[PDB]
Design a protein around this ligand. Structure first.
Ligand SMILES: [Fe+3]
Ligand SMILES: [Fe+3]
Length: 282
């Protein structure tokens, strides 16, 4: 596989791993409460902290994806959990991507740290619950009865992640209003993920082909579930943020928001998985 081979070859060349208080830390249009009348009752200070919390939450979701979904799938690939893979070159490509994911985790942890330090505030990760994709991943895991199911569940969600994360990162990578440290952090991550999408897509094709029909189907079902979870706004995380900030009447508004905004996608570019599924003839 010459896709894999040269990625392995020039990783050491391309890999990312080798403040204005007047700027917002995040995009207003990615805050669910921004689209509700309660936003008009909020002070400039509260609006600002919601923007900071937004960025912190975005970083947390990304860290949770890398640590709970992506790297664990990569580790299962190297350990031989899936048929149709193997070979030295793939092991090296995946091992490389694991370094990248860990570095992305560090970049996003630092993104939050800079914000905490510069805004002079905690914005603690401990205030945030597990992100929505993390929750749904876990729910599917808990419904599994067999080890092979758990592993296929993780592959499916990871494949979705790796192939869709460019679009999630795109939401901030090109914004020139927000902090440039934030934009630049997201862009640097984005650079690595193009190559992750290729690896992940290739691996998905070959695992799918080598699996028996029952297991193939189970895998696609987890892909579907993953994509739905991945592109959704995280209403639940945003509910934790507004409760912590003591926003008057957040609970009633949050219900109104879920009603009006449920069925919208935070991530609307699904070209990654659309293209993967088209190429696979499924
Ligand atoms: Fe990453
Ligand atoms: Fe990745």
């Amino acid at each position: 596989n010459a896709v894999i081979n040269r990625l392995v070859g020039n990783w050491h060349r391309r890999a990312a791993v080798k403040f204005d208080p007047g700027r917002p830390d995040f995009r207003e249009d990615m805050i669910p409460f921004r689209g509700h009348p309660i936003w008009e009752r909020l002070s400039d200070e509260t609006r600002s902290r919601l923007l900071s919390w937004g960025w912190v939450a975005y970083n947390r979701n990304t860290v949770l994806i890398e640590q709970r979904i992506a790297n664990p799938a990569f580790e299962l690939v190297i350990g031989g959990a899936y048929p149709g893979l193997g070979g030295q070159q793939l092991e090296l490509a995946v091992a490389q991507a694991m370094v990248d994911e860990q570095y992305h985790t560090l970049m996003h942890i630092n993104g939050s740290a800079v914000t905490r330090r510069m805004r002079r505030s905690d914005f603690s990760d401990r205030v945030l619950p597990d992100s929505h994709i993390t929750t749904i991943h876990q729910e599917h895991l808990d419904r599994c009865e067999e080890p092979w199911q758990r592993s296929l569940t993780t592959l499916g969600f990871a494949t979705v992640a790796e192939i869709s994360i460019n679009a999630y990162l795109d939401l901030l990578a090109d914004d020139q209003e927000i902090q440039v440290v934030n934009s630049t952090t997201v862009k640097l991550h984005n650079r690595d993920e193009y190559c992750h999408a290729s690896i992940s897509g290739e691996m998905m094709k070959q695992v799918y082909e080598a699996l028996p029909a029952d297991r193939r189907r189970f895998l696609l079902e987890k892909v579907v579930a993953g994509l739905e979870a991945f592109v959704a706004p995280d209403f639940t995380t945003w509910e934790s943020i507004v409760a912590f900030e003591g926003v008057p009447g957040w609970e009633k508004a949050a219900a109104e928001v879920r009603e009006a905004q449920g069925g919208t996608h935070l991530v609307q570019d699904h070209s990654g998985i659309h293209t993967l599924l088209t190429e696979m003839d499924v």
